[PDB]
Amino acid sequence: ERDCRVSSFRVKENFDKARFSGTWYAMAKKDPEGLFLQDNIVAEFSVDETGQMSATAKGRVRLLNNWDVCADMVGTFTDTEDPAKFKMKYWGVASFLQKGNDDHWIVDTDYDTYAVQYSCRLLNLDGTCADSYSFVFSRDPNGLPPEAQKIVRQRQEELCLARQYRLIVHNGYC
Ligand SMILES: CCCCCCCCCCCCCCCC(=O)O
Ligand SMILES: [Cl-]
Ligand SMILES: [Cl-]
């Protein structure tokens, strides 16, 4: 009976790009089809004077045949009418790395502790998402405090994803 229509999902009110800048460690991920970033995922968010948000990311990716590489990715965000919803153009510093353009929603954050991100790449005909991914980010690479963990779990459930996350390990591979 819970609403899993993407159009129903709440996102961060009055999202503040400047407060969001800096280092975010991925603690958990819900994978999309043909997943790219595997683990050791660390993102760096910036804003320029124009107010344009951008980011970089490091992480182990596993090209099939069991070949691991540390991908180095770049993203630039185009604003929409909702301050928490963006279009993210992304590519790798190496051109053979995956490129594309995904929706990028900041579903919730408190800026200094946790963030929950969401992207629906493709809708179902009933408004639910056919192909989604989601990152949970922490400022501390050792994980979230209990109060933040509990908030995040609630958001995960609201996105209809709470059963579908896996933990992201950080072991200095990159
Ligand atoms: C959304 C993650 C951090 C945002 C920074 C964007 C920098 C480019 C990272 C590309 C993410 C594309 C891969 C996401 C889906 C996946 O990993 O399977
Ligand atoms: Cl709990
Ligand atoms: Cl669960």
UniProtKB/Swiss-Prot annotation:
Annotated GO biological process: cardiac muscle tissue development; detection of light stimulus involved in visual perception; embryonic organ morphogenesis; embryonic retina morphogenesis in camera-type eye; embryonic skeletal system development; eye development; female genitalia morphogenesis; gluconeogenesis
Matches recorded under Pfam families: Lipocalin
Residue positions binding substrate: 98
Positions of post-translational Omega-N-methylarginine modification: 121
Disulphide linkage map: 4-160, 70-174, 120-129
Cellular compartment(s): Secreted
Keywords: Disease variant, Disulfide bond, Methylation, Microphthalmia, Retinol-binding, Secreted, Sensory transduction, Signal, Transport, Vision, Vitamin A
KW Signal (keyword) present: yes
GO cellular component: extracellular exosome; extracellular region; extracellular space; protein-containing complex
Effect of residue 57 to T: In MCOPCB10; dramatic reduction in retinol binding; has greater affinity for the STRA6 receptor
GO molecular function: molecular carrier activity; protein-containing complex binding; retinal binding; retinol binding; retinol transmembrane transporter activity
Distribution of this protein across tissues and organs: Detected in blood plasma and in urine (at protein level).
Keyword Signal: yes
Disease named in the record: Retinal dystrophy, iris coloboma, and comedogenic acne syndrome: A disease characterized by retinal degeneration, ocular colobomas involving both the anterior and posterior segment, impaired night vision and loss of visual acuity. Additional characteristic features include developmental abnormalities and severe acne.
Subunit structure: Interacts with TTR. Interaction with TTR prevents its loss by filtration through the kidney glomeruli. Interacts with STRA6.
Family of this protein: Belongs to the calycin superfamily. Lipocalin family.
Function field: Retinol-binding protein that mediates retinol transport in blood plasma. Delivers retinol from the liver stores to the peripheral tissues. Transfers the bound all-trans retinol to STRA6, that then facilitates retinol transport across the cell membrane.
Name under which the protein is recorded: Retinol-binding protein 4
Native organism: Homo sapiens (Human)
Record lineage: Eukaryota, Metazoa, Chordata, Craniata, Vertebrata
